[PDB]
A paper describes a structure:
To prove whether LIR2 interacts with the LIR-binding site in LC3, we solved two structures of an LIR2-LC3 fusion in two crystallization conditions. Both structures are identical and solved in the same space group. There are two molecules (molecule A and B) of the LIR2-LC3 fusion in one asymmetric unit with LIR2 of each molecule interacting with its symmetry-related LC3 molecule. The hydrophobic interaction of LIR2 with LC3 is conserved and adopts the classical LIR-LC3-binding mode. The first aromatic residue, F29, of LIR2 interacts with the first hydrophobic pocket (HP1) consisting of I23, P32, L53, F108 and the alkyl sidechain of K51 and the second aromatic residue L32 interacts with the second hydrophobic pocket (HP2) consisting of F52, V54, P55, V58, L63 and I66. The salt bridge interactions of residues LIR2E28 with LC3K51 and LIR2D30 with LC3R70 are observed in both structures. F52A mutation led to the reduction of LIR2 binding by about sixfold (Kd = 3.14 µM), while R70A mutation reduced binding affinity about 15-fold (Kd = 8.10 µM). No binding of the free LIR2 peptide with the LIR2-LC3 fusion protein was observed under these conditions, suggesting that the LIR2 peptide competes with the conjugated LIR2 peptide for binding to the LIR-binding site of LC3. Therefore, RavZ recognizes LC3 mainly via its N-terminal LIR2 motif by binding to the LIR-binding site in LC3.
Author numbering: -15 to -2, 4 to 117
Amino acid sequence: MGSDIDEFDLLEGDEKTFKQRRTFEQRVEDVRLIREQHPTKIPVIIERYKGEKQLPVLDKTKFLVPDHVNMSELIKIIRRRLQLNANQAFFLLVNGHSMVSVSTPISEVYESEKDEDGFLYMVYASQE
C-alpha cells in the first residue's frame, strides 16, 4: 500500500555563528580576558535560531550581562532591542531549552549551562 511512492531529498544552495567565526582556544582566551576585566559580568552569545523566519536579527551577538540580572529581565531586554510587539511569541533557549527558573541570577544559570569554552550560549526563536 502506497508502495508506488518514492522519496527525494531537496537540496538548497542557501553570517556564520560565533563558534564558526572563532576557534575554541580563541573563545577560551576571550573568556579569560573578560573574566579579568569585568569579574561581575557574564559573557553571553545570543543568536537567532537558524530556521527562524518570524523574528528579526540582532546586529550584535556578543554580550556582557551583569551577574544579578535574571532571565526575565534579559528576555525583556532582548524583546526591547528586537522591537517586538507585546503579543509576539518569543523564547530564549539555553542549551536548546527554555529556562524553567526565570527568577535566578544569570551567574547562577551560567554555572550550570555554560559551554566548555566558557561562554553561555543562547538562541532565540518563536517556538521551542
